[PDB]
Amino acid sequence: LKFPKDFLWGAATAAYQIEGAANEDGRGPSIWDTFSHTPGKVHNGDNGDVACDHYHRYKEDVELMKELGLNAYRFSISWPRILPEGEGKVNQKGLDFYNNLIDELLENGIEPFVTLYHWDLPQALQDKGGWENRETVDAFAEYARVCFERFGDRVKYWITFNEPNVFAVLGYLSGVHPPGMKDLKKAFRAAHNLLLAHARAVKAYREISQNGQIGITLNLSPVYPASDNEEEDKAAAERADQFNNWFLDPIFKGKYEHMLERLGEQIAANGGELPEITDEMEILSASLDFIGLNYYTSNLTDMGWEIYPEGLYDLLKRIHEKYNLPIYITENGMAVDDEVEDGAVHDTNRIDYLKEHLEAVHKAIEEGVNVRGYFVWSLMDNFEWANGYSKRFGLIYVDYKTQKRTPKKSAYWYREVIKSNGL
Ligand code: HEM
Ligand SMILES: [Mg+2]
């Protein structure tokens, strides 16, 4: 099973999950700094102040990427590390770090695959409403333009938002993620501003006219756990179904030109309050060079062992057949209760997970689906949001007391997969 000629072999991370240095070098706080320092919001009281200390250890981490032989590396830029208040003064040391990361990746032949927004909205913007406030759209447009001007000369692949469908549900409907709302009308309002923000970032990208591609990331198969009181999960599940069904409308499913109008009219229905739209609709008519898919499991509770690589194949066909755009598997991986035993981590079940999902990807590719890349989640164990560090997704084990990286068995297997360009 060989893969296309210039296929992207990579792994993915996100800024707040690995970087650390949360309160150093001019970085402003994100809502996840606020959230993880509030009692009872994150497992075991974990936070990402230190995380993997990737901010300080990136050269060692890139060296391990080179040992794995990664074509590309997907990461996110920390918005409050570039703009501590989300807008205005640019943090110089924050630019230096990402400029250094990008040069170090290119020096070793790893292509940056850069997410603008991976959920670390600057708290200052959240103080005045976050995505409920149209000014956050203004700030995301400026912040997107800033990364395009400082880094766009070396980054070829950009992602505006990572899973805006998941963030909307978790942060505005079930309230398990910041800003912790359980309100459907607020979620539609935030989704609307998120839509404008994406289009204005896409607009800003084409005005700078760099020869690269910009897209979005979606998790069309989201799975949410069962809390510990069923009444709220019922109310959160019912709010989520109303929100998801709205975006899965049979006649206007992927047509985001009409989605913005219907959304603003639906906002106008219950609340009104809708400001002018410059040209976003004609941007959202064709807003993507590629679509990134984040696949972990399928919706059809689990016992623990069930993997659904057949569902990733099914998703790949139907997305390809309906939207006819290049597809990147921007995230795929499995959490395992990993331990280090005599310098090794035998995560063979993770090897079986990735192996089965890759032959599903190869099946889609053989039937014409234009899959251009694959990224394991994650490159290393990291801060798994509200689960804290209790969930290890990495190809590389991180011992958080010593910050030592130990490549798991899955890392050596993946190196052989990349070297063969297939299975
Ligand atoms: C503000 C940003 C966005 C939000 C909040 C959002 C929201 C959603 C939601 C809730 C779903 C359904 C999730 C599920 O399947 O359970 C969805 C599906 C989808 N979204 Fe969006 N979306 C956004 C941007 C976009 C854009 C800009 C595009 C493409 C130009 C896009 C393409 C799709 C596609 C292809 C699907 C799958 C629809 C299908 O089943 O045919 N999304 N989105
Ligand atoms: Mg073994």
Numbering used by the authors: 9 to 308, 328 to 450
Q: What did the publication describing this PDB structure actually write?
A:
Family 1 glycosidases (GH1) commonly function as β-glucosidases and β-galactosidases, although other activities are also found in the family. GH1 enzymes are present in the three domains of life and have been traced back to LUCA23. We focus on a putative ancestor of modern bacterial and eukaryotic enzymes and find a number of unusual properties that clearly differentiate the ancestor from the properties of its modern descendants. Unexpectedly, the ancestral glycosidase binds heme tightly at a well-defined site in the structure with concomitant allosteric increase in enzyme activity.
Besides interactions with several hydrophobic residues, the bound heme interacts with Tyr264 of α-helix 8 (as the axial ligand), Tyr350 of α-helix 13, Arg345 of β-strand B and, directly via a water molecule, with Lys 261 of β-strand B, although this latter interaction is only observed in chain A. The bound heme shows B-factor values similar to those of the surrounding residues, it is well-packed and 95% buried. Indeed, the accessible surface area of the bound heme is only 43 Å2 compared to the ∼800 Å2 accessible surface area for a free heme. As observed in modern heme-binding proteins, the ancestral heme-binding pocket is enriched in hydrophobic and aromatic residues and propionate anchoring is achieved through interactions with arginine, tyrosine and lysine residues. Heme binding clearly rigidifies the ancestral protein, as shown by fewer missing regions in the electronic density map, in contrast to the structure of the heme-free protein. Lastly, we note that the heme is located near the enzyme active site (at about 8 Å from the catalytic glutamate at position 171) but does not have direct access to this site as revealed in the structure. Therefore, the increase in activity observed upon heme binding is an allosteric effect likely linked to dynamics (see “Discussion”) since heme binding does not substantially alter the position/conformation of the catalytic carboxylic acids nor the residues involved in substrate binding according to the static X-ray structures. The procedure involved in vitro reconstitution using hemin but did not include any chemical system capable of performing a reduction. It is therefore safe to assume that our heme-bound ancestral glycosidase contains iron in the +3 oxidation state. By contrast, heme appears at about 8 Å from the catalytic Glu171 in our ancestral glycosidase.
